[PDB]
Amino acid sequence: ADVQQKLAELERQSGGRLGVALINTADNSQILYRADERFAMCXTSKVMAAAAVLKKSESEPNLLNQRVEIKKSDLVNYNPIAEKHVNGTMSLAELSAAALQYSDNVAMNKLIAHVGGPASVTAFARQLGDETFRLDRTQPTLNTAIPGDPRDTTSPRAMAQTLRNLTLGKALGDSQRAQLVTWMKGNTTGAASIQAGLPASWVVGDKTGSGGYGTTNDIAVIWPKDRAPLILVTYFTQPQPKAESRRDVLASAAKIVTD
Ligand SMILES: [Cl-]
Ligand code: NA
């Protein structure tokens, strides 16, 4: 009740729309706030794309070593890693790491294309038992985050459950699960988001997202000191098309639900 009041107060002060789902594996409990509403995933969808490639690799041993050409025509709006590799190749492992750890747009698009496109990523989610996730578009258009638009959305509840399956459950084989967790623990983009609301000693693997309407997102697997792990999804979006980022809102939500 108090956690619910605190999240409602945070949402009101922020001016936007906040979605939270925490799974605490200590006691199999959840803390939910707008957890069945849809939110634009933005960058957070790259976990599903990378997981689809990892799943494909379970029946294609050297898949992660497969080379992918990077060309000027592949560049999109945010290419921090791929821009360094234009006119050469990157492996699927390198693209997965760039997508997950730097939010590289080109890398996401190569993962999407490899597995057959947005509808194939969505079909993979369905195979896992996630009937909420939808990836409709590639980068950069999947980030538009227009209010009322269901494209490229999921709910906090569904994303938390799916992230739990991918990182702590059995969606992926042991090698592939460990690889996903290692990639997420090496993320470089999340220090101001969920991590900023947790004690410094806790270990986090996370994936952020951002987009139009000031959309600011983070999804995380969290190992608190000497405790069972948590899964936390914090999704946030705002009324104005050109609203600025609000990573502090995600940090505040994380602090509220883990205090
Ligand atoms: Cl505006
Ligand atoms: Na989206």
mmCIF file of all heavy atoms in Angstrom, residues 50-99:
data_model
loop_
_atom_site.group_PDB
_atom_site.id
_atom_site.type_symbol
_atom_site.label_atom_id
_atom_site.label_comp_id
_atom_site.label_asym_id
_atom_site.label_seq_id
_atom_site.Cartn_x
_atom_site.Cartn_y
_atom_site.Cartn_z
ATOM 1 N N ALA A 50 18.427 -10.088 -29.315
ATOM 2 C CA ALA A 50 19.646 -10.825 -29.018
ATOM 3 C C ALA A 50 19.330 -12.236 -28.551
ATOM 4 O O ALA A 50 20.019 -13.191 -28.928
ATOM 5 C CB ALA A 50 20.464 -10.087 -27.961
ATOM 6 N N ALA A 51 18.281 -12.390 -27.741
ATOM 7 C CA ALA A 51 17.898 -13.716 -27.281
ATOM 8 C C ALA A 51 17.457 -14.605 -28.441
ATOM 9 O O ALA A 51 17.726 -15.814 -28.435
ATOM 10 C CB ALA A 51 16.803 -13.602 -26.228
ATOM 11 N N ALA A 52 16.787 -14.028 -29.445
ATOM 12 C CA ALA A 52 16.383 -14.820 -30.606
ATOM 13 C C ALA A 52 17.608 -15.348 -31.348
ATOM 14 O O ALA A 52 17.624 -16.499 -31.796
ATOM 15 C CB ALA A 52 15.505 -13.980 -31.532
ATOM 16 N N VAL A 53 18.637 -14.512 -31.503
ATOM 17 C CA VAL A 53 19.877 -14.966 -32.130
ATOM 18 C C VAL A 53 20.550 -16.038 -31.273
ATOM 19 O O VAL A 53 21.034 -17.046 -31.794
ATOM 20 C CB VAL A 53 20.804 -13.772 -32.411
ATOM 21 C CG1 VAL A 53 22.180 -14.247 -32.868
ATOM 22 C CG2 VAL A 53 20.177 -12.866 -33.460
ATOM 23 N N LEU A 54 20.592 -15.841 -29.951
ATOM 24 C CA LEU A 54 21.165 -16.853 -29.073
ATOM 25 C C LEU A 54 20.419 -18.172 -29.190
ATOM 26 O O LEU A 54 21.043 -19.238 -29.247
ATOM 27 C CB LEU A 54 21.174 -16.359 -27.621
ATOM 28 C CG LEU A 54 22.251 -15.328 -27.282
ATOM 29 C CD1 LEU A 54 21.970 -14.705 -25.929
ATOM 30 C CD2 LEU A 54 23.649 -15.934 -27.316
ATOM 31 N N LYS A 55 19.087 -18.131 -29.225
ATOM 32 C CA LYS A 55 18.321 -19.363 -29.397
ATOM 33 C C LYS A 55 18.663 -20.037 -30.726
ATOM 34 O O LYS A 55 18.853 -21.257 -30.787
ATOM 35 C CB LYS A 55 16.825 -19.057 -29.310
ATOM 36 C CG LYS A 55 15.907 -20.250 -29.551
ATOM 37 C CD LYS A 55 16.028 -21.322 -28.478
ATOM 38 C CE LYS A 55 14.925 -22.358 -28.625
ATOM 39 N NZ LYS A 55 15.030 -23.428 -27.610
ATOM 40 N N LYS A 56 18.731 -19.255 -31.808
ATOM 41 C CA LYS A 56 19.079 -19.807 -33.118
ATOM 42 C C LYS A 56 20.447 -20.484 -33.067
ATOM 43 O O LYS A 56 20.655 -21.534 -33.691
ATOM 44 C CB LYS A 56 19.041 -18.673 -34.158
ATOM 45 C CG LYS A 56 19.086 -19.085 -35.635
ATOM 46 C CD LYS A 56 18.780 -17.861 -36.529
ATOM 47 C CE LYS A 56 18.841 -18.145 -38.023
ATOM 48 N NZ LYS A 56 20.224 -18.350 -38.501
ATOM 49 N N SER A 57 21.375 -19.919 -32.279
ATOM 50 C CA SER A 57 22.730 -20.455 -32.183
ATOM 51 C C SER A 57 22.783 -21.811 -31.492
ATOM 52 O O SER A 57 23.774 -22.532 -31.642
ATOM 53 C CB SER A 57 23.673 -19.475 -31.473
ATOM 54 O OG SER A 57 23.555 -19.516 -30.058
ATOM 55 N N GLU A 58 21.750 -22.186 -30.746
ATOM 56 C CA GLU A 58 21.768 -23.483 -30.088
ATOM 57 C C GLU A 58 21.737 -24.630 -31.084
ATOM 58 O O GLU A 58 22.163 -25.735 -30.746
ATOM 59 C CB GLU A 58 20.602 -23.575 -29.108
ATOM 60 C CG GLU A 58 20.756 -22.611 -27.947
ATOM 61 C CD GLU A 58 19.595 -22.634 -26.994
ATOM 62 O OE1 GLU A 58 18.840 -23.622 -26.980
ATOM 63 O OE2 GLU A 58 19.432 -21.653 -26.248
ATOM 64 N N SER A 59 21.251 -24.401 -32.300
ATOM 65 C CA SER A 59 21.252 -25.424 -33.339
ATOM 66 C C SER A 59 22.162 -25.064 -34.508
ATOM 67 O O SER A 59 22.131 -25.745 -35.539
ATOM 68 C CB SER A 59 19.823 -25.698 -33.817
ATOM 69 O OG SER A 59 19.168 -24.506 -34.195
ATOM 70 N N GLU A 60 22.976 -24.019 -34.362
ATOM 71 C CA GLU A 60 23.944 -23.604 -35.379
ATOM 72 C C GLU A 60 25.209 -23.186 -34.640
ATOM 73 O O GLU A 60 25.377 -22.008 -34.289
ATOM 74 C CB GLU A 60 23.432 -22.415 -36.184
ATOM 75 C CG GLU A 60 22.194 -22.657 -37.000
ATOM 76 C CD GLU A 60 21.861 -21.455 -37.868
ATOM 77 O OE1 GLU A 60 22.776 -20.932 -38.546
ATOM 78 O OE2 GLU A 60 20.693 -21.018 -37.866
ATOM 79 N N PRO A 61 26.116 -24.133 -34.375
ATOM 80 C CA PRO A 61 27.215 -23.858 -33.430
ATOM 81 C C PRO A 61 27.972 -22.567 -33.674
ATOM 82 O O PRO A 61 28.154 -21.778 -32.740
ATOM 83 C CB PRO A 61 28.117 -25.091 -33.581
ATOM 84 C CG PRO A 61 27.188 -26.180 -33.981
ATOM 85 C CD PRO A 61 26.129 -25.530 -34.844
ATOM 86 N N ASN A 62 28.445 -22.338 -34.896
ATOM 87 C CA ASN A 62 29.307 -21.199 -35.160
ATOM 88 C C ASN A 62 28.533 -19.949 -35.563
ATOM 89 O O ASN A 62 29.136 -19.008 -36.082
ATOM 90 C CB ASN A 62 30.370 -21.547 -36.206
ATOM 91 C CG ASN A 62 31.681 -20.827 -35.948
ATOM 92 O OD1 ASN A 62 31.947 -20.404 -34.825
ATOM 93 N ND2 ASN A 62 32.505 -20.686 -36.979
ATOM 94 N N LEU A 63 27.219 -19.922 -35.321
ATOM 95 C CA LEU A 63 26.395 -18.756 -35.622
ATOM 96 C C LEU A 63 26.983 -17.460 -35.071
ATOM 97 O O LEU A 63 27.021 -16.450 -35.777
ATOM 98 C CB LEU A 63 24.956 -18.941 -35.155
ATOM 99 C CG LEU A 63 24.035 -17.827 -35.672
ATOM 100 C CD1 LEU A 63 24.040 -17.783 -37.193
ATOM 101 C CD2 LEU A 63 22.638 -18.015 -35.132
ATOM 102 N N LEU A 64 27.390 -17.436 -33.804
ATOM 103 C CA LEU A 64 27.832 -16.167 -33.233
ATOM 104 C C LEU A 64 29.087 -15.633 -33.918
ATOM 105 O O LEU A 64 29.350 -14.427 -33.865
ATOM 106 C CB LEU A 64 28.031 -16.288 -31.724
ATOM 107 C CG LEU A 64 26.757 -16.535 -30.916
ATOM 108 C CD1 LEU A 64 27.090 -16.676 -29.442
ATOM 109 C CD2 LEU A 64 25.742 -15.420 -31.121
ATOM 110 N N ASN A 65 29.870 -16.500 -34.559
ATOM 111 C CA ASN A 65 31.044 -16.073 -35.303
ATOM 112 C C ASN A 65 30.729 -15.634 -36.730
ATOM 113 O O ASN A 65 31.636 -15.149 -37.418
ATOM 114 C CB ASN A 65 32.082 -17.199 -35.348
ATOM 115 C CG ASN A 65 32.762 -17.419 -34.014
ATOM 116 O OD1 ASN A 65 32.921 -16.491 -33.227
ATOM 117 N ND2 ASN A 65 33.183 -18.650 -33.765
ATOM 118 N N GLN A 66 29.486 -15.785 -37.190
ATOM 119 C CA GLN A 66 29.142 -15.409 -38.554
ATOM 120 C C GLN A 66 29.361 -13.912 -38.752
ATOM 121 O O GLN A 66 28.999 -13.096 -37.901
ATOM 122 C CB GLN A 66 27.683 -15.783 -38.841
ATOM 123 C CG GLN A 66 27.249 -15.562 -40.275
ATOM 124 C CD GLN A 66 25.827 -16.037 -40.542
ATOM 125 O OE1 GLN A 66 25.484 -17.195 -40.305
ATOM 126 N NE2 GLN A 66 24.992 -15.138 -41.041
ATOM 127 N N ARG A 67 29.947 -13.558 -39.899
ATOM 128 C CA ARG A 67 30.298 -12.184 -40.233
ATOM 129 C C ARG A 67 29.136 -11.496 -40.947
ATOM 130 O O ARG A 67 28.457 -12.102 -41.787
ATOM 131 C CB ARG A 67 31.531 -12.141 -41.151
ATOM 132 C CG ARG A 67 32.768 -12.925 -40.689
ATOM 133 C CD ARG A 67 33.313 -12.529 -39.315
ATOM 134 N NE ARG A 67 33.734 -11.135 -39.189
ATOM 135 C CZ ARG A 67 34.264 -10.607 -38.086
ATOM 136 N NH1 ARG A 67 34.471 -11.351 -36.999
ATOM 137 N NH2 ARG A 67 34.594 -9.327 -38.069
ATOM 138 N N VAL A 68 28.954 -10.213 -40.641
ATOM 139 C CA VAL A 68 27.912 -9.381 -41.221
ATOM 140 C C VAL A 68 28.569 -8.108 -41.746
ATOM 141 O O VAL A 68 29.266 -7.416 -40.998
ATOM 142 C CB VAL A 68 26.866 -9.024 -40.145
ATOM 143 C CG1 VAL A 68 25.778 -8.166 -40.725
ATOM 144 C CG2 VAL A 68 26.289 -10.282 -39.514
ATOM 145 N N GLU A 69 28.344 -7.791 -43.021
ATOM 146 C CA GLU A 69 28.886 -6.562 -43.586
ATOM 147 C C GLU A 69 28.193 -5.339 -42.998
ATOM 148 O O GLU A 69 26.966 -5.308 -42.869
ATOM 149 C CB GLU A 69 28.669 -6.538 -45.100
ATOM 150 C CG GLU A 69 29.335 -7.657 -45.862
ATOM 151 C CD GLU A 69 30.810 -7.424 -46.104
ATOM 152 O OE1 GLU A 69 31.337 -6.379 -45.669
ATOM 153 O OE2 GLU A 69 31.444 -8.294 -46.737
ATOM 154 N N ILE A 70 28.986 -4.315 -42.693
ATOM 155 C CA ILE A 70 28.496 -3.012 -42.262
ATOM 156 C C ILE A 70 28.825 -2.022 -43.374
ATOM 157 O O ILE A 70 29.986 -1.912 -43.780
ATOM 158 C CB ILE A 70 29.159 -2.577 -40.945
ATOM 159 C CG1 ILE A 70 29.082 -3.678 -39.876
ATOM 160 C CG2 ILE A 70 28.563 -1.257 -40.473
ATOM 161 C CD1 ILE A 70 27.691 -4.113 -39.501
ATOM 162 N N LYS A 71 27.817 -1.300 -43.851
ATOM 163 C CA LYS A 71 27.960 -0.354 -44.949
ATOM 164 C C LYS A 71 27.396 0.992 -44.534
ATOM 165 O O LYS A 71 26.632 1.099 -43.576
ATOM 166 C CB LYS A 71 27.205 -0.846 -46.185
ATOM 167 C CG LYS A 71 27.709 -2.172 -46.686
ATOM 168 C CD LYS A 71 26.904 -2.658 -47.864
ATOM 169 C CE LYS A 71 27.516 -3.921 -48.435
ATOM 170 N NZ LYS A 71 26.757 -4.442 -49.605
ATOM 171 N N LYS A 72 27.746 2.035 -45.287
ATOM 172 C CA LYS A 72 27.175 3.345 -44.996
ATOM 173 C C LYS A 72 25.654 3.296 -45.037
ATOM 174 O O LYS A 72 24.981 3.979 -44.252
ATOM 175 C CB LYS A 72 27.707 4.391 -45.976
ATOM 176 C CG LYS A 72 29.141 4.798 -45.675
ATOM 177 C CD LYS A 72 29.583 6.001 -46.480
ATOM 178 C CE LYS A 72 30.901 6.553 -45.966
ATOM 179 N NZ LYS A 72 30.749 7.506 -44.824
ATOM 180 N N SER A 73 25.096 2.487 -45.946
ATOM 181 C CA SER A 73 23.652 2.379 -46.079
ATOM 182 C C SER A 73 22.989 1.747 -44.863
ATOM 183 O O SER A 73 21.762 1.829 -44.743
ATOM 184 C CB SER A 73 23.293 1.578 -47.333
ATOM 185 O OG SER A 73 23.822 0.270 -47.271
ATOM 186 N N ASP A 74 23.754 1.106 -43.980
ATOM 187 C CA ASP A 74 23.197 0.557 -42.757
ATOM 188 C C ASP A 74 23.069 1.595 -41.650
ATOM 189 O O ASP A 74 22.343 1.357 -40.680
ATOM 190 C CB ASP A 74 24.111 -0.559 -42.240
ATOM 191 C CG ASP A 74 24.104 -1.782 -43.118
ATOM 192 O OD1 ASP A 74 23.006 -2.288 -43.406
ATOM 193 O OD2 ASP A 74 25.197 -2.255 -43.490
ATOM 194 N N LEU A 75 23.796 2.706 -41.729
ATOM 195 C CA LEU A 75 23.800 3.650 -40.622
ATOM 196 C C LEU A 75 22.399 4.211 -40.411
ATOM 197 O O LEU A 75 21.666 4.491 -41.370
ATOM 198 C CB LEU A 75 24.818 4.762 -40.874
ATOM 199 C CG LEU A 75 26.276 4.286 -40.962
ATOM 200 C CD1 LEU A 75 27.163 5.426 -41.437
ATOM 201 C CD2 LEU A 75 26.777 3.727 -39.641
ATOM 202 N N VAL A 76 22.030 4.363 -39.143
ATOM 203 C CA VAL A 76 20.747 4.936 -38.755
ATOM 204 C C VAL A 76 21.036 6.152 -37.877
ATOM 205 O O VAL A 76 21.986 6.891 -38.152
ATOM 206 C CB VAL A 76 19.773 3.899 -38.161
ATOM 207 C CG1 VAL A 76 19.291 2.979 -39.303
ATOM 208 C CG2 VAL A 76 20.373 3.102 -37.101
ATOM 209 N N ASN A 77 20.268 6.371 -36.810
ATOM 210 C CA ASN A 77 20.406 7.608 -36.054
ATOM 211 C C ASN A 77 21.371 7.528 -34.873
ATOM 212 O O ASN A 77 21.779 8.575 -34.372
ATOM 213 C CB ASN A 77 19.028 8.094 -35.594
ATOM 214 C CG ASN A 77 18.151 8.527 -36.759
ATOM 215 O OD1 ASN A 77 18.631 8.705 -37.884
ATOM 216 N ND2 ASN A 77 16.860 8.709 -36.495
ATOM 217 N N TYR A 78 21.753 6.342 -34.419
ATOM 218 C CA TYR A 78 22.637 6.197 -33.267
ATOM 219 C C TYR A 78 23.450 4.920 -33.451
ATOM 220 O O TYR A 78 22.923 3.817 -33.289
ATOM 221 C CB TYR A 78 21.852 6.161 -31.947
ATOM 222 C CG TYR A 78 22.772 6.200 -30.755
ATOM 223 C CD1 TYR A 78 23.548 7.318 -30.502
ATOM 224 C CD2 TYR A 78 22.889 5.116 -29.900
ATOM 225 C CE1 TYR A 78 24.397 7.370 -29.426
ATOM 226 C CE2 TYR A 78 23.740 5.157 -28.805
ATOM 227 C CZ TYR A 78 24.495 6.288 -28.579
ATOM 228 O OH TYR A 78 25.349 6.343 -27.503
ATOM 229 N N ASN A 79 24.726 5.073 -33.818
ATOM 230 C CA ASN A 79 25.567 4.018 -34.338
ATOM 231 C C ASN A 79 26.936 4.039 -33.667
ATOM 232 O O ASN A 79 27.960 4.007 -34.381
ATOM 233 C CB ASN A 79 25.749 4.177 -35.872
ATOM 234 C CG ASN A 79 24.516 4.753 -36.553
ATOM 235 O OD1 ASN A 79 23.459 4.145 -36.588
ATOM 236 N ND2 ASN A 79 24.670 5.938 -37.135
ATOM 237 N N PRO A 80 27.013 4.098 -32.337
ATOM 238 C CA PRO A 80 28.303 4.349 -31.679
ATOM 239 C C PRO A 80 29.380 3.318 -31.979
ATOM 240 O O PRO A 80 30.573 3.657 -31.994
ATOM 241 C CB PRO A 80 27.921 4.328 -30.191
ATOM 242 C CG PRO A 80 26.629 3.519 -30.140
ATOM 243 C CD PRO A 80 25.912 3.934 -31.378
ATOM 244 N N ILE A 81 29.006 2.058 -32.155
ATOM 245 C CA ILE A 81 29.954 0.996 -32.454
ATOM 246 C C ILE A 81 30.029 0.731 -33.952
ATOM 247 O O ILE A 81 31.114 0.663 -34.529
ATOM 248 C CB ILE A 81 29.610 -0.289 -31.665
ATOM 249 C CG1 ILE A 81 29.500 -0.011 -30.156
ATOM 250 C CG2 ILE A 81 30.647 -1.373 -31.967
ATOM 251 C CD1 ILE A 81 30.710 0.642 -29.542
ATOM 252 N N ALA A 82 28.877 0.588 -34.607
ATOM 253 C CA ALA A 82 28.880 0.229 -36.020
ATOM 254 C C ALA A 82 29.608 1.266 -36.870
ATOM 255 O O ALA A 82 30.212 0.910 -37.886
ATOM 256 C CB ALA A 82 27.450 0.043 -36.526
ATOM 257 N N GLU A 83 29.569 2.547 -36.485
ATOM 258 C CA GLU A 83 30.239 3.565 -37.292
ATOM 259 C C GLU A 83 31.739 3.316 -37.391
ATOM 260 O O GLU A 83 32.379 3.808 -38.328
ATOM 261 C CB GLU A 83 29.947 4.977 -36.764
ATOM 262 C CG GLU A 83 30.644 5.346 -35.466
ATOM 263 C CD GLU A 83 30.326 6.758 -34.975
ATOM 264 O OE1 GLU A 83 29.448 7.429 -35.552
ATOM 265 O OE2 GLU A 83 30.975 7.201 -34.005
ATOM 266 N N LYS A 84 32.313 2.575 -36.441
ATOM 267 C CA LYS A 84 33.734 2.252 -36.445
ATOM 268 C C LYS A 84 34.081 1.095 -37.372
ATOM 269 O O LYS A 84 35.268 0.830 -37.590
ATOM 270 C CB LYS A 84 34.183 1.852 -35.037
ATOM 271 C CG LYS A 84 33.871 2.837 -33.940
ATOM 272 C CD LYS A 84 34.388 2.282 -32.627
ATOM 273 C CE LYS A 84 33.949 3.102 -31.442
ATOM 274 N NZ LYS A 84 34.446 2.470 -30.191
ATOM 275 N N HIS A 85 33.079 0.393 -37.902
ATOM 276 C CA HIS A 85 33.276 -0.844 -38.653
ATOM 277 C C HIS A 85 32.749 -0.745 -40.072
ATOM 278 O O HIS A 85 32.692 -1.758 -40.776
ATOM 279 C CB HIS A 85 32.608 -2.020 -37.928
ATOM 280 C CG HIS A 85 33.229 -2.323 -36.608
ATOM 281 N ND1 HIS A 85 34.304 -3.171 -36.471
ATOM 282 C CD2 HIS A 85 32.949 -1.862 -35.365
ATOM 283 C CE1 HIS A 85 34.654 -3.228 -35.201
ATOM 284 N NE2 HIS A 85 33.854 -2.437 -34.510
ATOM 285 N N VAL A 86 32.358 0.450 -40.506
ATOM 286 C CA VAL A 86 31.857 0.620 -41.859
ATOM 287 C C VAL A 86 32.897 0.138 -42.859
ATOM 288 O O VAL A 86 34.093 0.442 -42.755
ATOM 289 C CB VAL A 86 31.446 2.081 -42.086
ATOM 290 C CG1 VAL A 86 31.148 2.331 -43.547
ATOM 291 C CG2 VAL A 86 30.229 2.416 -41.231
ATOM 292 N N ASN A 87 32.425 -0.627 -43.838
ATOM 293 C CA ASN A 87 33.194 -1.239 -44.915
ATOM 294 C C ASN A 87 33.964 -2.472 -44.479
ATOM 295 O O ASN A 87 34.714 -3.045 -45.289
ATOM 296 C CB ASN A 87 34.068 -0.231 -45.659
ATOM 297 C CG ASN A 87 33.231 0.792 -46.372
ATOM 298 O OD1 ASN A 87 32.125 0.496 -46.837
ATOM 299 N ND2 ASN A 87 33.737 2.007 -46.455
ATOM 300 N N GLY A 88 33.773 -2.919 -43.245
ATOM 301 C CA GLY A 88 34.241 -4.211 -42.813
ATOM 302 C C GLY A 88 33.070 -5.045 -42.349
ATOM 303 O O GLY A 88 31.912 -4.713 -42.627
ATOM 304 N N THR A 89 33.364 -6.138 -41.652
ATOM 305 C CA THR A 89 32.327 -6.957 -41.050
ATOM 306 C C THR A 89 32.436 -6.935 -39.530
ATOM 307 O O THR A 89 33.496 -6.654 -38.961
ATOM 308 C CB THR A 89 32.381 -8.417 -41.530
ATOM 309 O OG1 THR A 89 33.605 -9.026 -41.091
ATOM 310 C CG2 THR A 89 32.245 -8.520 -43.032
ATOM 311 N N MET A 90 31.313 -7.259 -38.885
ATOM 312 C CA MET A 90 31.244 -7.559 -37.467
ATOM 313 C C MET A 90 30.629 -8.941 -37.315
ATOM 314 O O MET A 90 29.779 -9.341 -38.114
ATOM 315 C CB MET A 90 30.354 -6.552 -36.733
ATOM 316 C CG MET A 90 30.922 -5.141 -36.726
ATOM 317 S SD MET A 90 29.796 -3.906 -36.044
ATOM 318 C CE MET A 90 29.755 -4.394 -34.314
ATOM 319 N N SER A 91 31.028 -9.669 -36.274
ATOM 320 C CA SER A 91 30.365 -10.936 -36.014
ATOM 321 C C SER A 91 29.001 -10.695 -35.358
ATOM 322 O O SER A 91 28.736 -9.641 -34.775
ATOM 323 C CB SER A 91 31.209 -11.813 -35.092
ATOM 324 O OG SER A 91 31.268 -11.230 -33.805
ATOM 325 N N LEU A 92 28.150 -11.726 -35.405
ATOM 326 C CA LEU A 92 26.883 -11.644 -34.685
ATOM 327 C C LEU A 92 27.095 -11.480 -33.183
ATOM 328 O O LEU A 92 26.303 -10.796 -32.525
ATOM 329 C CB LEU A 92 25.988 -12.840 -35.019
ATOM 330 C CG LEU A 92 25.303 -12.774 -36.386
ATOM 331 C CD1 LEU A 92 24.631 -14.103 -36.719
ATOM 332 C CD2 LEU A 92 24.272 -11.652 -36.441
ATOM 333 N N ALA A 93 28.158 -12.067 -32.617
ATOM 334 C CA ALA A 93 28.461 -11.822 -31.210
ATOM 335 C C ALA A 93 28.769 -10.350 -30.966
ATOM 336 O O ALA A 93 28.280 -9.749 -30.001
ATOM 337 C CB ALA A 93 29.641 -12.685 -30.761
ATOM 338 N N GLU A 94 29.603 -9.755 -31.824
ATOM 339 C CA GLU A 94 29.941 -8.345 -31.667
ATOM 340 C C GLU A 94 28.713 -7.461 -31.822
ATOM 341 O O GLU A 94 28.578 -6.447 -31.126
ATOM 342 C CB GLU A 94 30.996 -7.940 -32.701
ATOM 343 C CG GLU A 94 32.378 -8.483 -32.405
ATOM 344 C CD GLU A 94 33.384 -8.246 -33.517
ATOM 345 O OE1 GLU A 94 33.001 -8.206 -34.701
ATOM 346 O OE2 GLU A 94 34.584 -8.127 -33.205
ATOM 347 N N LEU A 95 27.833 -7.801 -32.765
ATOM 348 C CA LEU A 95 26.613 -7.026 -32.943
ATOM 349 C C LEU A 95 25.705 -7.161 -31.727
ATOM 350 O O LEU A 95 25.105 -6.180 -31.279
ATOM 351 C CB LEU A 95 25.904 -7.466 -34.224
ATOM 352 C CG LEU A 95 26.668 -7.034 -35.479
ATOM 353 C CD1 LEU A 95 26.294 -7.895 -36.675
ATOM 354 C CD2 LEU A 95 26.397 -5.568 -35.801
ATOM 355 N N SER A 96 25.602 -8.364 -31.175
ATOM 356 C CA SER A 96 24.791 -8.551 -29.973
ATOM 357 C C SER A 96 25.333 -7.705 -28.827
ATOM 358 O O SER A 96 24.574 -7.036 -28.116
ATOM 359 C CB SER A 96 24.776 -10.029 -29.584
ATOM 360 O OG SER A 96 24.163 -10.831 -30.574
ATOM 361 N N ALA A 97 26.652 -7.741 -28.619
ATOM 362 C CA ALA A 97 27.259 -6.940 -27.560
ATOM 363 C C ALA A 97 27.057 -5.449 -27.800
ATOM 364 O O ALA A 97 26.777 -4.696 -26.861
ATOM 365 C CB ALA A 97 28.747 -7.271 -27.441
ATOM 366 N N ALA A 98 27.195 -4.997 -29.048
ATOM 367 C CA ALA A 98 27.034 -3.572 -29.329
ATOM 368 C C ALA A 98 25.597 -3.125 -29.086
ATOM 369 O O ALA A 98 25.352 -2.042 -28.534
ATOM 370 C CB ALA A 98 27.441 -3.286 -30.775
ATOM 371 N N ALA A 99 24.637 -3.938 -29.520
ATOM 372 C CA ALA A 99 23.232 -3.625 -29.276
ATOM 373 C C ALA A 99 22.955 -3.547 -27.778
ATOM 374 O O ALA A 99 22.357 -2.582 -27.285
ATOM 375 C CB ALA A 99 22.347 -4.694 -29.913
#
